[PDB]
Amino acid sequence: AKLVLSQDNLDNEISALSLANEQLETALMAQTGKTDKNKYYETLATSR
Amino acid sequence: FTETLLYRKRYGIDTETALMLCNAGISRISYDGQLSHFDRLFNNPPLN
């Protein structure tokens, strides 16, 4: 619903795997409440 | 502009490298829907 229709969104190529990674990061960081990225990979460094 | 054409004529370079030889700044802004020169220089991929 937020998505904008543009010629750039239609033409430009992105990595689909990077889009999947972003889609998972924006949910996990919203669950943990932390807004930083590298802080989340630091707290993911130790988790089991 | 004519230095840009000359510095592309000799050395056989891309035109943006010839512009960077011609004392032009690094563009943060994406040109023609790709990675910008700042991002393709530094954040392709972002380090860690």
PDB file of N, CA and C in Angstrom:
ATOM      1  N   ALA A   1       0.824  -1.201   0.000  1.00  0.00           N
ATOM      2  CA  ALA A   1       0.000   0.000   0.000  1.00  0.00           C
ATOM      3  C   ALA A   1       0.859   1.252   0.000  1.00  0.00           C
ATOM      4  N   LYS A   2       2.054   1.164   0.571  1.00  0.00           N
ATOM      5  CA  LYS A   2       3.018   2.252   0.572  1.00  0.00           C
ATOM      6  C   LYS A   2       3.721   2.394  -0.773  1.00  0.00           C
ATOM      7  N   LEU A   3       3.619   1.381  -1.630  1.00  0.00           N
ATOM      8  CA  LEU A   3       4.474   1.275  -2.804  1.00  0.00           C
ATOM      9  C   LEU A   3       4.128   2.316  -3.856  1.00  0.00           C
ATOM     10  N   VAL A   4       5.163   2.954  -4.394  1.00  0.00           N
ATOM     11  CA  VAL A   4       5.016   4.012  -5.382  1.00  0.00           C
ATOM     12  C   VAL A   4       5.269   3.435  -6.772  1.00  0.00           C
ATOM     13  N   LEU A   5       4.409   3.796  -7.721  1.00  0.00           N
ATOM     14  CA  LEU A   5       4.566   3.386  -9.109  1.00  0.00           C
ATOM     15  C   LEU A   5       5.369   4.442  -9.851  1.00  0.00           C
ATOM     16  N   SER A   6       6.517   4.052 -10.384  1.00  0.00           N
ATOM     17  CA  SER A   6       7.380   4.984 -11.081  1.00  0.00           C
ATOM     18  C   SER A   6       8.092   4.250 -12.199  1.00  0.00           C
ATOM     19  N   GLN A   7       8.696   5.025 -13.098  1.00  0.00           N
ATOM     20  CA  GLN A   7       9.478   4.424 -14.168  1.00  0.00           C
ATOM     21  C   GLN A   7      10.760   3.813 -13.622  1.00  0.00           C
ATOM     22  N   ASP A   8      11.269   4.361 -12.518  1.00  0.00           N
ATOM     23  CA  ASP A   8      12.465   3.812 -11.893  1.00  0.00           C
ATOM     24  C   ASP A   8      12.181   2.470 -11.234  1.00  0.00           C
ATOM     25  N   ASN A   9      11.032   2.341 -10.565  1.00  0.00           N
ATOM     26  CA  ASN A   9      10.665   1.060  -9.972  1.00  0.00           C
ATOM     27  C   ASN A   9      10.377   0.013 -11.034  1.00  0.00           C
ATOM     28  N   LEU A  10       9.898   0.437 -12.198  1.00  0.00           N
ATOM     29  CA  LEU A  10       9.626  -0.512 -13.263  1.00  0.00           C
ATOM     30  C   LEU A  10      10.898  -0.936 -13.980  1.00  0.00           C
ATOM     31  N   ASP A  11      11.866  -0.036 -14.127  1.00  0.00           N
ATOM     32  CA  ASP A  11      13.030  -0.325 -14.953  1.00  0.00           C
ATOM     33  C   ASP A  11      14.226  -0.861 -14.185  1.00  0.00           C
ATOM     34  N   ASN A  12      14.505  -0.347 -12.990  1.00  0.00           N
ATOM     35  CA  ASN A  12      15.775  -0.649 -12.346  1.00  0.00           C
ATOM     36  C   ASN A  12      15.779  -2.043 -11.747  1.00  0.00           C
ATOM     37  N   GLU A  13      16.929  -2.701 -11.840  1.00  0.00           N
ATOM     38  CA  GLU A  13      17.089  -4.055 -11.347  1.00  0.00           C
ATOM     39  C   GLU A  13      17.772  -4.045  -9.991  1.00  0.00           C
ATOM     40  N   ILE A  14      17.231  -4.830  -9.068  1.00  0.00           N
ATOM     41  CA  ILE A  14      17.800  -4.998  -7.745  1.00  0.00           C
ATOM     42  C   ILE A  14      17.991  -6.486  -7.498  1.00  0.00           C
ATOM     43  N   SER A  15      18.840  -6.801  -6.529  1.00  0.00           N
ATOM     44  CA  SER A  15      19.028  -8.183  -6.126  1.00  0.00           C
ATOM     45  C   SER A  15      17.822  -8.634  -5.318  1.00  0.00           C
ATOM     46  N   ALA A  16      17.204  -9.740  -5.742  1.00  0.00           N
ATOM     47  CA  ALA A  16      16.011 -10.233  -5.061  1.00  0.00           C
ATOM     48  C   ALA A  16      16.345 -10.760  -3.674  1.00  0.00           C
ATOM     49  N   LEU A  17      17.543 -11.316  -3.521  1.00  0.00           N
ATOM     50  CA  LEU A  17      17.983 -11.806  -2.224  1.00  0.00           C
ATOM     51  C   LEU A  17      18.181 -10.665  -1.238  1.00  0.00           C
ATOM     52  N   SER A  18      18.690  -9.528  -1.715  1.00  0.00           N
ATOM     53  CA  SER A  18      18.844  -8.363  -0.852  1.00  0.00           C
ATOM     54  C   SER A  18      17.490  -7.811  -0.435  1.00  0.00           C
ATOM     55  N   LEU A  19      16.500  -7.916  -1.317  1.00  0.00           N
ATOM     56  CA  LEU A  19      15.157  -7.475  -0.974  1.00  0.00           C
ATOM     57  C   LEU A  19      14.528  -8.395   0.062  1.00  0.00           C
ATOM     58  N   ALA A  20      14.799  -9.701  -0.034  1.00  0.00           N
ATOM     59  CA  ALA A  20      14.342 -10.636   0.995  1.00  0.00           C
ATOM     60  C   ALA A  20      15.005 -10.355   2.335  1.00  0.00           C
ATOM     61  N   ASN A  21      16.301 -10.038   2.309  1.00  0.00           N
ATOM     62  CA  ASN A  21      17.022  -9.721   3.535  1.00  0.00           C
ATOM     63  C   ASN A  21      16.482  -8.459   4.187  1.00  0.00           C
ATOM     64  N   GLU A  22      16.197  -7.432   3.385  1.00  0.00           N
ATOM     65  CA  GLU A  22      15.609  -6.204   3.907  1.00  0.00           C
ATOM     66  C   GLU A  22      14.222  -6.454   4.480  1.00  0.00           C
ATOM     67  N   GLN A  23      13.444  -7.317   3.820  1.00  0.00           N
ATOM     68  CA  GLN A  23      12.099  -7.623   4.288  1.00  0.00           C
ATOM     69  C   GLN A  23      12.121  -8.385   5.606  1.00  0.00           C
ATOM     70  N   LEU A  24      13.162  -9.183   5.849  1.00  0.00           N
ATOM     71  CA  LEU A  24      13.258  -9.854   7.145  1.00  0.00           C
ATOM     72  C   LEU A  24      13.841  -8.944   8.220  1.00  0.00           C
ATOM     73  N   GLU A  25      14.805  -8.089   7.848  1.00  0.00           N
ATOM     74  CA  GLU A  25      15.403  -7.164   8.807  1.00  0.00           C
ATOM     75  C   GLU A  25      14.384  -6.170   9.339  1.00  0.00           C
ATOM     76  N   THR A  26      13.514  -5.655   8.465  1.00  0.00           N
ATOM     77  CA  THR A  26      12.542  -4.662   8.902  1.00  0.00           C
ATOM     78  C   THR A  26      11.465  -5.243   9.806  1.00  0.00           C
ATOM     79  N   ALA A  27      11.323  -6.565   9.856  1.00  0.00           N
ATOM     80  CA  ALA A  27      10.427  -7.199  10.810  1.00  0.00           C
ATOM     81  C   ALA A  27      11.140  -7.550  12.103  1.00  0.00           C
ATOM     82  N   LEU A  28      12.370  -8.059  12.002  1.00  0.00           N
ATOM     83  CA  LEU A  28      13.098  -8.472  13.199  1.00  0.00           C
ATOM     84  C   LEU A  28      13.495  -7.283  14.059  1.00  0.00           C
ATOM     85  N   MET A  29      13.947  -6.194  13.435  1.00  0.00           N
ATOM     86  CA  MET A  29      14.315  -5.017  14.208  1.00  0.00           C
ATOM     87  C   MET A  29      13.087  -4.329  14.789  1.00  0.00           C
ATOM     88  N   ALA A  30      11.934  -4.477  14.135  1.00  0.00           N
ATOM     89  CA  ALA A  30      10.697  -3.955  14.699  1.00  0.00           C
ATOM     90  C   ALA A  30      10.226  -4.797  15.874  1.00  0.00           C
ATOM     91  N   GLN A  31      10.505  -6.101  15.848  1.00  0.00           N
ATOM     92  CA  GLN A  31      10.197  -6.942  17.002  1.00  0.00           C
ATOM     93  C   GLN A  31      11.096  -6.605  18.182  1.00  0.00           C
ATOM     94  N   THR A  32      12.400  -6.484  17.944  1.00  0.00           N
ATOM     95  CA  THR A  32      13.302  -6.210  19.054  1.00  0.00           C
ATOM     96  C   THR A  32      13.326  -4.740  19.453  1.00  0.00           C
ATOM     97  N   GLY A  33      12.717  -3.854  18.665  1.00  0.00           N
ATOM     98  CA  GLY A  33      12.644  -2.447  19.000  1.00  0.00           C
ATOM     99  C   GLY A  33      13.871  -1.626  18.671  1.00  0.00           C
ATOM    100  N   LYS A  34      15.022  -2.252  18.456  1.00  0.00           N
ATOM    101  CA  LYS A  34      16.240  -1.536  18.110  1.00  0.00           C
ATOM    102  C   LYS A  34      16.159  -1.071  16.663  1.00  0.00           C
ATOM    103  N   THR A  35      16.559   0.174  16.421  1.00  0.00           N
ATOM    104  CA  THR A  35      16.497   0.727  15.077  1.00  0.00           C
ATOM    105  C   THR A  35      17.807   0.587  14.315  1.00  0.00           C
ATOM    106  N   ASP A  36      18.912   0.332  15.006  1.00  0.00           N
ATOM    107  CA  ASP A  36      20.205   0.199  14.358  1.00  0.00           C
ATOM    108  C   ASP A  36      20.290  -1.143  13.642  1.00  0.00           C
ATOM    109  N   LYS A  37      21.178  -1.223  12.655  1.00  0.00           N
ATOM    110  CA  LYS A  37      21.420  -2.502  12.003  1.00  0.00           C
ATOM    111  C   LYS A  37      22.581  -3.256  12.634  1.00  0.00           C
ATOM    112  N   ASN A  38      23.733  -2.602  12.777  1.00  0.00           N
ATOM    113  CA  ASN A  38      24.928  -3.300  13.233  1.00  0.00           C
ATOM    114  C   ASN A  38      24.837  -3.677  14.701  1.00  0.00           C
ATOM    115  N   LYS A  39      24.069  -2.919  15.479  1.00  0.00           N
ATOM    116  CA  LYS A  39      23.763  -3.332  16.841  1.00  0.00           C
ATOM    117  C   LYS A  39      22.935  -4.607  16.851  1.00  0.00           C
ATOM    118  N   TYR A  40      22.080  -4.791  15.846  1.00  0.00           N
ATOM    119  CA  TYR A  40      21.273  -6.001  15.798  1.00  0.00           C
ATOM    120  C   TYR A  40      22.096  -7.205  15.365  1.00  0.00           C
ATOM    121  N   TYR A  41      23.080  -7.010  14.493  1.00  0.00           N
ATOM    122  CA  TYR A  41      23.960  -8.127  14.175  1.00  0.00           C
ATOM    123  C   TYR A  41      24.961  -8.387  15.287  1.00  0.00           C
ATOM    124  N   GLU A  42      25.220  -7.397  16.139  1.00  0.00           N
ATOM    125  CA  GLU A  42      26.042  -7.664  17.310  1.00  0.00           C
ATOM    126  C   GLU A  42      25.260  -8.442  18.360  1.00  0.00           C
ATOM    127  N   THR A  43      23.973  -8.139  18.530  1.00  0.00           N
ATOM    128  CA  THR A  43      23.183  -8.948  19.449  1.00  0.00           C
ATOM    129  C   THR A  43      22.731 -10.256  18.819  1.00  0.00           C
ATOM    130  N   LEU A  44      22.893 -10.407  17.508  1.00  0.00           N
ATOM    131  CA  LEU A  44      22.649 -11.671  16.831  1.00  0.00           C
ATOM    132  C   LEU A  44      23.910 -12.526  16.791  1.00  0.00           C
ATOM    133  N   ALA A  45      25.056 -11.921  17.096  1.00  0.00           N
ATOM    134  CA  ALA A  45      26.330 -12.628  17.107  1.00  0.00           C
ATOM    135  C   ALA A  45      26.408 -13.696  18.186  1.00  0.00           C
ATOM    136  N   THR A  46      25.673 -13.534  19.278  1.00  0.00           N
ATOM    137  CA  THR A  46      25.801 -14.407  20.431  1.00  0.00           C
ATOM    138  C   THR A  46      24.597 -15.325  20.592  1.00  0.00           C
ATOM    139  N   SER A  47      23.488 -15.009  19.934  1.00  0.00           N
ATOM    140  CA  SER A  47      22.222 -15.682  20.179  1.00  0.00           C
ATOM    141  C   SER A  47      22.230 -17.120  19.684  1.00  0.00           C
ATOM    142  N   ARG A  48      21.410 -17.949  20.334  1.00  0.00           N
ATOM    143  CA  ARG A  48      21.350 -19.377  20.068  1.00  0.00           C
ATOM    144  C   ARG A  48      19.971 -19.855  19.651  1.00  0.00           C
TER     145      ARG A  48
ATOM    146  N   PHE B   1      34.746  20.761 -20.627  1.00  0.00           N
ATOM    147  CA  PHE B   1      34.138  19.777 -21.516  1.00  0.00           C
ATOM    148  C   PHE B   1      35.137  19.264 -22.545  1.00  0.00           C
ATOM    149  N   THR B   2      35.968  20.150 -23.094  1.00  0.00           N
ATOM    150  CA  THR B   2      36.921  19.677 -24.086  1.00  0.00           C
ATOM    151  C   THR B   2      38.083  18.937 -23.436  1.00  0.00           C
ATOM    152  N   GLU B   3      38.419  19.264 -22.182  1.00  0.00           N
ATOM    153  CA  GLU B   3      39.351  18.432 -21.436  1.00  0.00           C
ATOM    154  C   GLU B   3      38.759  17.065 -21.166  1.00  0.00           C
ATOM    155  N   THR B   4      37.449  16.998 -20.918  1.00  0.00           N
ATOM    156  CA  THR B   4      36.802  15.710 -20.702  1.00  0.00           C
ATOM    157  C   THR B   4      36.861  14.851 -21.955  1.00  0.00           C
ATOM    158  N   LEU B   5      36.603  15.458 -23.117  1.00  0.00           N
ATOM    159  CA  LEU B   5      36.710  14.722 -24.373  1.00  0.00           C
ATOM    160  C   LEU B   5      38.145  14.296 -24.662  1.00  0.00           C
ATOM    161  N   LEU B   6      39.123  15.141 -24.337  1.00  0.00           N
ATOM    162  CA  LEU B   6      40.518  14.770 -24.563  1.00  0.00           C
ATOM    163  C   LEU B   6      40.975  13.668 -23.614  1.00  0.00           C
ATOM    164  N   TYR B   7      40.597  13.765 -22.342  1.00  0.00           N
ATOM    165  CA  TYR B   7      41.002  12.783 -21.349  1.00  0.00           C
ATOM    166  C   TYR B   7      40.236  11.488 -21.514  1.00  0.00           C
ATOM    167  N   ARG B   8      39.142  11.507 -22.271  1.00  0.00           N
ATOM    168  CA  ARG B   8      38.523  10.263 -22.694  1.00  0.00           C
ATOM    169  C   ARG B   8      39.165   9.735 -23.970  1.00  0.00           C
ATOM    170  N   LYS B   9      39.631  10.634 -24.842  1.00  0.00           N
ATOM    171  CA  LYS B   9      40.251  10.241 -26.103  1.00  0.00           C
ATOM    172  C   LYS B   9      41.565   9.519 -25.868  1.00  0.00           C
ATOM    173  N   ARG B  10      42.511  10.179 -25.213  1.00  0.00           N
ATOM    174  CA  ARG B  10      43.618   9.421 -24.659  1.00  0.00           C
ATOM    175  C   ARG B  10      43.140   8.721 -23.399  1.00  0.00           C
ATOM    176  N   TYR B  11      43.838   7.637 -23.057  1.00  0.00           N
ATOM    177  CA  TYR B  11      43.661   6.739 -21.912  1.00  0.00           C
ATOM    178  C   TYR B  11      42.421   5.854 -22.009  1.00  0.00           C
ATOM    179  N   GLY B  12      41.538   6.117 -22.971  1.00  0.00           N
ATOM    180  CA  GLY B  12      40.335   5.325 -23.224  1.00  0.00           C
ATOM    181  C   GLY B  12      39.436   5.053 -22.036  1.00  0.00           C
ATOM    182  N   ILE B  13      38.968   6.095 -21.351  1.00  0.00           N
ATOM    183  CA  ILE B  13      38.279   5.871 -20.088  1.00  0.00           C
ATOM    184  C   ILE B  13      36.776   6.049 -20.281  1.00  0.00           C
ATOM    185  N   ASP B  14      36.017   5.671 -19.255  1.00  0.00           N
ATOM    186  CA  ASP B  14      34.630   6.090 -19.141  1.00  0.00           C
ATOM    187  C   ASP B  14      34.573   7.601 -18.931  1.00  0.00           C
ATOM    188  N   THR B  15      33.429   8.191 -19.275  1.00  0.00           N
ATOM    189  CA  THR B  15      33.320   9.642 -19.224  1.00  0.00           C
ATOM    190  C   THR B  15      33.209  10.170 -17.798  1.00  0.00           C
ATOM    191  N   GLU B  16      32.718   9.366 -16.851  1.00  0.00           N
ATOM    192  CA  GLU B  16      32.638   9.871 -15.485  1.00  0.00           C
ATOM    193  C   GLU B  16      34.004   9.882 -14.820  1.00  0.00           C
ATOM    194  N   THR B  17      34.891   8.962 -15.201  1.00  0.00           N
ATOM    195  CA  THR B  17      36.260   9.013 -14.709  1.00  0.00           C
ATOM    196  C   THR B  17      36.991  10.219 -15.274  1.00  0.00           C
ATOM    197  N   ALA B  18      36.721  10.552 -16.536  1.00  0.00           N
ATOM    198  CA  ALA B  18      37.284  11.754 -17.131  1.00  0.00           C
ATOM    199  C   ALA B  18      36.736  13.009 -16.477  1.00  0.00           C
ATOM    200  N   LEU B  19      35.482  12.978 -16.025  1.00  0.00           N
ATOM    201  CA  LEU B  19      34.966  14.098 -15.246  1.00  0.00           C
ATOM    202  C   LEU B  19      35.622  14.180 -13.877  1.00  0.00           C
ATOM    203  N   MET B  20      35.935  13.035 -13.267  1.00  0.00           N
ATOM    204  CA  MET B  20      36.604  13.071 -11.970  1.00  0.00           C
ATOM    205  C   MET B  20      38.042  13.542 -12.100  1.00  0.00           C
ATOM    206  N   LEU B  21      38.677  13.288 -13.242  1.00  0.00           N
ATOM    207  CA  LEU B  21      39.950  13.932 -13.534  1.00  0.00           C
ATOM    208  C   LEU B  21      39.791  15.417 -13.778  1.00  0.00           C
ATOM    209  N   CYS B  22      38.601  15.854 -14.173  1.00  0.00           N
ATOM    210  CA  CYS B  22      38.362  17.237 -14.547  1.00  0.00           C
ATOM    211  C   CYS B  22      37.836  18.054 -13.370  1.00  0.00           C
ATOM    212  N   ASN B  23      38.169  17.620 -12.147  1.00  0.00           N
ATOM    213  CA  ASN B  23      37.866  18.314 -10.891  1.00  0.00           C
ATOM    214  C   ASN B  23      36.361  18.475 -10.684  1.00  0.00           C
ATOM    215  N   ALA B  24      35.633  17.370 -10.771  1.00  0.00           N
ATOM    216  CA  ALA B  24      34.209  17.357 -10.479  1.00  0.00           C
ATOM    217  C   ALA B  24      33.948  16.543  -9.220  1.00  0.00           C
ATOM    218  N   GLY B  25      32.906  16.929  -8.486  1.00  0.00           N
ATOM    219  CA  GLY B  25      32.619  16.283  -7.225  1.00  0.00           C
ATOM    220  C   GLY B  25      31.963  14.926  -7.389  1.00  0.00           C
ATOM    221  N   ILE B  26      32.037  14.131  -6.328  1.00  0.00           N
ATOM    222  CA  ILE B  26      31.402  12.821  -6.315  1.00  0.00           C
ATOM    223  C   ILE B  26      29.909  13.010  -6.100  1.00  0.00           C
ATOM    224  N   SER B  27      29.106  12.414  -6.970  1.00  0.00           N
ATOM    225  CA  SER B  27      27.662  12.579  -6.915  1.00  0.00           C
ATOM    226  C   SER B  27      27.059  11.548  -5.971  1.00  0.00           C
ATOM    227  N   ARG B  28      26.343  12.026  -4.952  1.00  0.00           N
ATOM    228  CA  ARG B  28      25.518  11.139  -4.144  1.00  0.00           C
ATOM    229  C   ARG B  28      24.293  10.648  -4.896  1.00  0.00           C
ATOM    230  N   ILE B  29      23.893  11.346  -5.949  1.00  0.00           N
ATOM    231  CA  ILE B  29      22.574  11.188  -6.543  1.00  0.00           C
ATOM    232  C   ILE B  29      22.653  10.166  -7.666  1.00  0.00           C
ATOM    233  N   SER B  30      21.707   9.233  -7.680  1.00  0.00           N
ATOM    234  CA  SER B  30      21.710   8.162  -8.664  1.00  0.00           C
ATOM    235  C   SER B  30      21.344   8.689 -10.043  1.00  0.00           C
ATOM    236  N   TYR B  31      22.172   8.359 -11.027  1.00  0.00           N
ATOM    237  CA  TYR B  31      22.016   8.843 -12.390  1.00  0.00           C
ATOM    238  C   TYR B  31      21.541   7.702 -13.272  1.00  0.00           C
ATOM    239  N   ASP B  32      20.414   7.927 -13.955  1.00  0.00           N
ATOM    240  CA  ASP B  32      19.803   6.991 -14.905  1.00  0.00           C
ATOM    241  C   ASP B  32      19.465   5.650 -14.258  1.00  0.00           C
ATOM    242  N   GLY B  33      19.100   5.686 -12.982  1.00  0.00           N
ATOM    243  CA  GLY B  33      18.588   4.518 -12.292  1.00  0.00           C
ATOM    244  C   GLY B  33      19.583   3.410 -12.022  1.00  0.00           C
ATOM    245  N   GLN B  34      20.779   3.752 -11.554  1.00  0.00           N
ATOM    246  CA  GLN B  34      21.733   2.751 -11.097  1.00  0.00           C
ATOM    247  C   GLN B  34      22.280   3.145  -9.738  1.00  0.00           C
ATOM    248  N   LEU B  35      23.310   2.442  -9.277  1.00  0.00           N
ATOM    249  CA  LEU B  35      24.026   2.876  -8.090  1.00  0.00           C
ATOM    250  C   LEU B  35      24.765   4.170  -8.380  1.00  0.00           C
ATOM    251  N   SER B  36      24.657   5.122  -7.461  1.00  0.00           N
ATOM    252  CA  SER B  36      25.359   6.378  -7.628  1.00  0.00           C
ATOM    253  C   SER B  36      26.855   6.162  -7.443  1.00  0.00           C
ATOM    254  N   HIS B  37      27.634   7.155  -7.876  1.00  0.00           N
ATOM    255  CA  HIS B  37      29.086   7.025  -7.855  1.00  0.00           C
ATOM    256  C   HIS B  37      29.618   6.960  -6.434  1.00  0.00           C
ATOM    257  N   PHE B  38      28.987   7.694  -5.518  1.00  0.00           N
ATOM    258  CA  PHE B  38      29.304   7.587  -4.101  1.00  0.00           C
ATOM    259  C   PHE B  38      28.976   6.204  -3.561  1.00  0.00           C
ATOM    260  N   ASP B  39      27.795   5.684  -3.870  1.00  0.00           N
ATOM    261  CA  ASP B  39      27.412   4.371  -3.380  1.00  0.00           C
ATOM    262  C   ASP B  39      28.110   3.235  -4.108  1.00  0.00           C
ATOM    263  N   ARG B  40      28.358   3.353  -5.414  1.00  0.00           N
ATOM    264  CA  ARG B  40      29.111   2.289  -6.067  1.00  0.00           C
ATOM    265  C   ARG B  40      30.590   2.369  -5.752  1.00  0.00           C
ATOM    266  N   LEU B  41      31.050   3.487  -5.199  1.00  0.00           N
ATOM    267  CA  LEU B  41      32.432   3.604  -4.777  1.00  0.00           C
ATOM    268  C   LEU B  41      32.625   3.095  -3.360  1.00  0.00           C
ATOM    269  N   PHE B  42      31.674   3.363  -2.471  1.00  0.00           N
ATOM    270  CA  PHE B  42      31.825   3.013  -1.068  1.00  0.00           C
ATOM    271  C   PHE B  42      30.933   1.865  -0.622  1.00  0.00           C
ATOM    272  N   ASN B  43      29.654   1.876  -0.980  1.00  0.00           N
ATOM    273  CA  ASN B  43      28.688   0.957  -0.386  1.00  0.00           C
ATOM    274  C   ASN B  43      28.233  -0.133  -1.340  1.00  0.00           C
ATOM    275  N   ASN B  44      29.136  -0.704  -2.130  1.00  0.00           N
ATOM    276  CA  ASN B  44      28.802  -1.805  -3.027  1.00  0.00           C
ATOM    277  C   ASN B  44      29.738  -2.969  -2.725  1.00  0.00           C
ATOM    278  N   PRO B  45      29.415  -3.805  -1.728  1.00  0.00           N
ATOM    279  CA  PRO B  45      28.336  -3.748  -0.738  1.00  0.00           C
ATOM    280  C   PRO B  45      28.766  -2.910   0.457  1.00  0.00           C
ATOM    281  N   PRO B  46      27.846  -2.537   1.347  1.00  0.00           N
ATOM    282  CA  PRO B  46      28.262  -1.868   2.585  1.00  0.00           C
ATOM    283  C   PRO B  46      29.126  -2.786   3.428  1.00  0.00           C
ATOM    284  N   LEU B  47      30.259  -2.256   3.870  1.00  0.00           N
ATOM    285  CA  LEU B  47      31.253  -3.069   4.550  1.00  0.00           C
ATOM    286  C   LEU B  47      30.762  -3.432   5.944  1.00  0.00           C
ATOM    287  N   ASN B  48      30.646  -4.742   6.194  1.00  0.00           N
ATOM    288  CA  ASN B  48      30.059  -5.319   7.413  1.00  0.00           C
ATOM    289  C   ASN B  48      28.646  -4.807   7.662  1.00  0.00           C
TER     290      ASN B  48
END
